[model samples]
Target: ANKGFLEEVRKGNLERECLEEPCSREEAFEALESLSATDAFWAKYTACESARNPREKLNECLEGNCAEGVGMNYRGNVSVTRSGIECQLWRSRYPHKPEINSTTHPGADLRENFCRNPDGSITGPWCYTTSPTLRREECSVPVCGQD
Candidate 1:
């Protein structure tokens, strides 16, 4: 019975899976480039939104897909851009915090310009001090609804 079923299924009009064929290498690369561009745009958007409120931090993080990028070890690029915006805002807002030449200080690293973590949640810029730490767990910050 199983053999007959299998044969029947095979005989059924199953469109050739590879009929369309895989994209060419150049096409695949272009697709990847497009995706990367989209990711970069979303990352910037999230960073901007995060600057608004702590409650929106996690959503911004998820929207940026920071976890996936950081997990794969490409977050440095994203962080650099994101942190730049944060630092600009920080300098404009505070202008009094000890001026340090470090990427973690917003002006240096855009990715690190995330929201401050509240007491209960184990997430946000405060949770990770260094790039390695951020890469490992920065994206773990829960979105607004999760907690």
Candidate 2:
């Protein structure tokens, strides 16, 4: 399990469940068995998810999906919206924490310099561009490497 997952369970109240177990650890789980009675734990789990995504600062939020970016410009709708603008992305130290480098240019755009293979079902973003000047952000930090 992800450390975050375990941490969440540890933080919440399972003392009642453990009340029956006399061993060092419970033989098994009654995971979230309280759903029928209280909803606080449910609320807490969901909050933990968003908390991992921290939102007060646009540049620094939680993990985004393939189609989305941190703050504003995502999919860089280059022609209709962020067409003329440049954008950048941020990466974390552990490579997952320093997340949320949202769209610097906003648009529904996705195909100016991107590459599509064969029948075009698959994609490669920015594969057609030779010059960095046409990008949403000139000095972008890649999600993984030091780009």
Candidate 3:
């Protein structure tokens, strides 16, 4: 309840916390639901206040999107940067845990660090306008109280 489900998952602790934390998934949602509607509150916790928790996302994505619900997969971290930019290390694997923005993933970010040479090389005109990222998903309208 104190953290988003992805945080728990990345630490390799979803099962661990599931065993240790007194709160179950239902409890976690309940705790978040009880929170008051405030920009200040949500500013501190957009993910929790929102119904699209990463654990729920992973399970749903896995069942339909990954492996035909067959093999195990870690979606890895799609984390928020220090400047509050959301990003994913699309090439990262379990335990390797690649650092964010270390390289450009084609579709992951529309903004590129620098243009690639079809073979990822350093050269001129890196990006026409370089920036952190869209400073910006679809899905079922889970009722997180319409706040």
Among these predictions, the greatest TM-score belongs to 1
| Residue range 90-110, candidate 1, lDDT tens digits | 223233342332333322233
Candidate 3 versus the native: TM-score? Answer: 0.16
Pairwise lDDT winner, candidates 1 and 3: 1
List pairs with backbone clashes in candidate 3: 114-126, 115-126
- Write candidate 3's Cα lDDT for 26-127 as tens digits: 433343433232221222222222223455643343222221111111122223333433333234332223333324332123122212111122221111
Count of backbone clashes for each model? 8, 12, 2
Per-candidate TM-scores read 0.20, 0.16, 0.16
> What's the candidate order when arranged by decreasing lDDT?
1, 3, 2
> lDDT of all predictions, in order shown?
0.31, 0.25, 0.28
Candidate 3: deviation at residue 24, Å? 16
Candidate scoring better on lDDT of 1 and 2? 1
Tell me how far candidate 2 lies from the true structure as C-alpha RMSD in angstroms: 16.0
Please give the range of 10 consecutive residues that has the lowest summed lDDT in model 2: 115-124
Off by over 4 Å in 3: 1-12, 16-58, 62-147
